[PDB]
Design a binder for this molecule. Structure first.
Ligand SMILES: COCCOc1cnc(N)nc1-c1c[nH]c2ccc(C#CC(C)(C)O)cc12
Length: 335
């Protein structure tokens, strides 16, 4: 019956210009499962032709800009009829999670990558989204070694707005870190990408994240103790991860890596939070604010909105955003 299912069946076997809600629905079918070509497209700039949107036929990836993404899944692409250019993320069908789209579909904080659509074709789900010419934050830190305190403070702030947005839409991101924040061309704007590890929350219990088939975990070095202990998990998980990213930006390396060899998860469980990785150099309110995000107990840890306030204050005290985004290389901190 479900009136709902009737709408979803109306979507199957084709790709159509449609809305977020349609994409969102049709996506959930993909998580549950010439193997069809189907999907929905959110801009007119990416246009299906005769019920179809096939790679190399209707759209072409640019041979060759570099593949970005952890698995080199992200590519520059072009619509062959329209001439409009954007990014694709490839996700293998048999591990596609509908949360990835839920997290960016439609209503748009500017701290969340714009989703331009998705179509499935064969063993792939192709996700289309605005090309952000600025690159990843992770690229930035690698090119600069590590970042000036004001820049790091500034990007942490814009990630936190994005998180605040998702946490209000009741989705947690699950793997926040520099590689999953994208920059605008001038470096002035950050938005989150890579919602492949996102999860939703319900009334309010507080799901234990890992343990499950469904769930693949975030970056080990950035995971919160309640994740690793197999405890109850919620949005606070992203505020821990975001402070690990902060430490990344300052020191030019991930937390933990420089002190223990592995497995690192046990150390995150057994040991005090890596506040000893805060540079002494830093302003009181910077340190203070990282301290408050790296509380091992998520009930005690600051929310994303709360932390955001603290960093905007730490940005005042350090003297506003002054340093250019691409200046001198800065020596990473040594072991
Ligand atoms: C390494 O930085 C190069 C610049 O890359 C990008 C540019 N523009 C966009 N939209 N995404 C990216 C992008 C890079 N890596 C990624 C990893 C994951 C995703 C994603 C995603 C969704 C939103 C589909 O979950 C996008 C990207």
């Amino acid at each position: 019956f479900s009136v709902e299912e009737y709408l979803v069946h109306a979507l199957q076997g084709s790709v159509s210009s449609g809305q977020a809600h349609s994409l969102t629905s049709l996506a959930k079918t993909w998580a549950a499962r010439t193997e069809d070509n189907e999907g929905v497209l959110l801009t007119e700039k990416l246009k299906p032709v005769d019920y179809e949107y096939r790679e190399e036929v209707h759209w072409a990836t640019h041979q060759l800009r570099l593949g970005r993404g952890s698995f080199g899944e992200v590519h520059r692409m072009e619509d062959k009829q329209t001439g409009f250019q954007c990014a694709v993320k490839k996700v293998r069908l048999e591990v596609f999670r509908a949360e990835e789209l839920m997290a960016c579909a439609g209503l748009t904080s500017p701290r969340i990558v714009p989703l331009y659509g998705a179509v499935r074709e064969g063993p792939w789900v192709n996700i289309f989204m605005e090309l952000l010419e600025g690159g990843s934050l992770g690229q930035l830190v690698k090119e600069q070694g590590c970042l000036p305190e004001d820049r790091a403070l500034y990007y942490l702030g814009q990630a936190l707005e994005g998180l605040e947005y998702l946490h209000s839409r009741r989705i947690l991101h699950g793997d926040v870190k520099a590689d999953n924040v994208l920059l605008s061309s001038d470096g002035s704007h950050a938005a989150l990408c890579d919602f492949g590890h996102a999860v939703c929350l319900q009334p309010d219990g507080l799901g234990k994240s890992l343990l499950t088939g469904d769930y693949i975990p975030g970056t080990e070095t950035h995971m919160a103790p309640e994740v690793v202990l197999g405890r109850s998990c919620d949005a606070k998980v992203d505020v821990w991860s975001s402070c690990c990213m902060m430490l990344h930006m300052l020191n030019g390396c991930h937390p933990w890596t420089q002190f223990f060899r592995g497995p690192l998860c046990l150390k995150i469980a057994s040991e005090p939070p890596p506040v000893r990785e805060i540079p002494p150099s830093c302003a009181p309110l910077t340190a203070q604010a990282i301290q408050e995000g790296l509380r091992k107990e998520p009930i005690h840890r600051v929310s994303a909105a709360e932390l955001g306030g603290k960093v905007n204050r730490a940005l005042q005290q350090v003297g506003g955003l002054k340093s250019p985004w691409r200046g001198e290389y800065k020596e990473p901190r040594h072991p």
